[PDB]
Design an enzyme around this catalytic site. Structure first.
Site, PDB file in Angstrom:
ATOM      1  N   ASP A   1       0.855  -1.168   0.000  1.00 26.45           N
ATOM      2  CA  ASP A   1       0.000   0.000   0.000  1.00 26.45           C
ATOM      3  C   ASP A   1       0.888   1.213   0.000  1.00 26.45           C
ATOM      4  OD1 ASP A   1       0.721   0.776   3.108  1.00 26.45           O
ATOM      5  OD2 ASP A   1       0.451  -1.408   2.958  1.00 26.45           O
TER       6      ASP A   1
ATOM      7  N   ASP B   1       1.614   4.794   1.784  1.00 23.00           N
ATOM      8  CA  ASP B   1       1.449   4.958   3.215  1.00 23.00           C
ATOM      9  C   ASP B   1       0.584   6.201   3.205  1.00 23.00           C
ATOM     10  OD1 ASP B   1       2.129   4.333   5.922  1.00 23.00           O
ATOM     11  OD2 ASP B   1       3.489   6.022   5.887  1.00 23.00           O
TER      12      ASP B   1
END
Lengths: 266, 267, 269
Positions: free
Chosen positions: C212, C214
């Site tokens: 992902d 951040d």
């Protein structure tokens, strides 16, 4: 034996002449005992719990506070809103002693605390991109504005380990490099734990002094002094905030209110 | 006969020089925190009562993160120590602070992670001010002595203290230097300096540059530190003794930021 | 009867381990001077290579990053004769061009953890291992050569900033990790695993799996979004992993292994 609002601050924030069902209770937790007995009271039909994080005579320093017990105790009473009040140093000339600040961010520089209720076997990683509860932040800000109290509406709180105060080189770094706005010692892990307990938590920071980068550096003494001179202000702010709190925070305006749904590793 | 000393020396073994000190006696002191890194060696230098305490222990068996800092500082205080000269090997973060040069820092940045930082755990809460963490009185005498002896000694510096025991990563080092702007680097300064301040002592460290940190021909090594160290142990001893000869009985409070630290630090 | 041995150690999540590609599977439990490893170690063979799998969080992922017994894990692999340690870890990205699903083989790290045990040397033997180049270059290049041949997007450099956790970064912290420290990826388990592996003189490298962006991204990182994506790329690392193992020489080349002779120069005498 129940409360929906939790106030974590200094002693004396407790106003015995505006709170009704006073009551003192001691609560045992899986983590030992809270900083002190909790004071339950009523304010306009709102059940409130006061918990001075340093204990009534300020005997517990920041690095020794049993943060897990405090937050767990509040949670066991049913607290949903937690208003944390804290003296803070300022890292920018426009945030002045006497001014209030409702930070929206923090940077953790603490070193040997316990940061979470989740040590295993259930692993959780709570999201804290927006660490504070927006619902409570805006009510505090709305109330501050109506009361005419100077309050900055955003700010990054850098939490250091203490107990000693920052060195001048450290302070230059917090300010110029990390770009923090205010500085204190008790926010973390209080804020982590409140989030993991799914509470709507916000801190009112009372600027007591410029940190080091200033004229006559920060002393434990000037903090205690400017604090007193503004305790009256926060008590007004505090009560006005409580008078306006809805029964439950709006989940859509509370980043941690459903923190667990997405934090557990399954 | 109460054992006393007004001067405390915390460094490596060796600093202590057998027949240079005259009324040498070894003592063991028990403290509310357990035992000091080693027995303390009491001695006289021109009528000055001095206490030597090697922070790593005589055979250097205690790493930075395991040093009983509270016991060490409490032991020096209990003997009546007022001046504390700390000697430490340090890495340089700037090409102009060279291996062999000394440094008497005036600032520090604490990047350690799991040590005990204070004597005040409750019920007395204290928050000592450390804007100017070292004792100016002692720093200037050390610098005056360095100048008279002709020993290259930079008169200021920001010491960044890392946890260790491993040395910095090149990315960490670039950050310490370019971002934090630290000047020298080591592992034992904190909490030694916090504790000395809370004990209201006049404390100053002499940093002996041992190596450039990571930006250098060959990166810093433990063996390299030990190597350059010996080559300069001789220099610090001369400096050390000259500094001691010049110390007034008590540091001047107006030039000692921590000498009255408690008057204002208690809540 | 024969003693348990492995020259290759794999530390990651459960799942990397596979019953169909590792032949002589044996599960062992090893006791160490530090207590017990996150889980029993699974011994297996892959092309005549003896391999040990250790899921750092334990098979059911019941151990958080700050509670992992890093010393026991590293010491257990060392005692089995492990020389190559391939560590696999989910990581968040701090730069838009390092995308979810991409892999990264970092060459640097920044430790921002706070209350862990960082070394095997607490005295009386004091040691200060050099970590200017923290990872094992030999293993890094084999991983990158393998990723290239398999066509798996893999950034060949990067600074991993390790945080204490378990909570995820604040937006102000993340801006600082990115703009100030200039870290490229972020995780919670690298340190002290990497310190300990170096002190054990092992040739160690991590394959970071970007899960992902951040907080500076679409909608912030959630524990659940790391679970979802990880799975979607577990298949990729398994291929990578096995291809890497197929190419490992018997021993890493010391001239390409910063920590393989770490103790010769790190002890204080």
């Amino acid at each position: 034996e129940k409360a929906s609002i939790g106030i974590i601050g200094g002693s004396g924030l407790y106003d015995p002449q505006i709170l009704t069902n006073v009551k003192e209770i001691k609560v045992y937790t899986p983590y030992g005992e809270p900083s002190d007995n909790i004071i339950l009271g009523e304010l306009e039909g709102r059940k409130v719990a006061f918990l001075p994080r340093h204990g009534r005579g300020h005997r517990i320093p920041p690095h020794k506070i049993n943060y897990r017990a405090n937050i767990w105790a509040l949670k066991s009473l049913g607290v949903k809103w937690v208003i944390a009040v804290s003296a803070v140093g300022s890292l920018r000339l426009d945030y002045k002693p006497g001014d209030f600040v409702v930070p929206n961010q923090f940077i953790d520089m603490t070193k040997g605390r316990t940061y979470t209720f989740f040590d295993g076997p259930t692993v959780a990683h709570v999201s804290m991109a927006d660490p504070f509860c927006e619902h409570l932040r805006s009510i505090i800000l709305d109330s501050a504005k109506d009361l005419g109290i100077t309050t900055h509406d955003k700010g990054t709180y850098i939490c250091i380990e203490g107990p000693r105060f920052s060195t001048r080189a450290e302070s230059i770094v917090w300010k110029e490099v990390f770009k923090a706005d205010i500085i204190g010692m008790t926010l973390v892990p209080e804020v982590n734990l409140a989030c993991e307990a799914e509470m709507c938590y916000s801190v009112i920071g009372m600027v007591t002094d410029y940190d080091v980068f200033a004229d006559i550096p920060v002393t434990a003494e000037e903090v205690t002094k400017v604090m007193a001179e503004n305790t009256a202000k926060v008590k007004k702010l505090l009560y006005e905030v409580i008078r306006r709190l809805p029964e439950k925070p709006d989940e859509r305006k509370c980043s941690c209110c459903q923190a667990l749904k997405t934090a557990l590793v399954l």
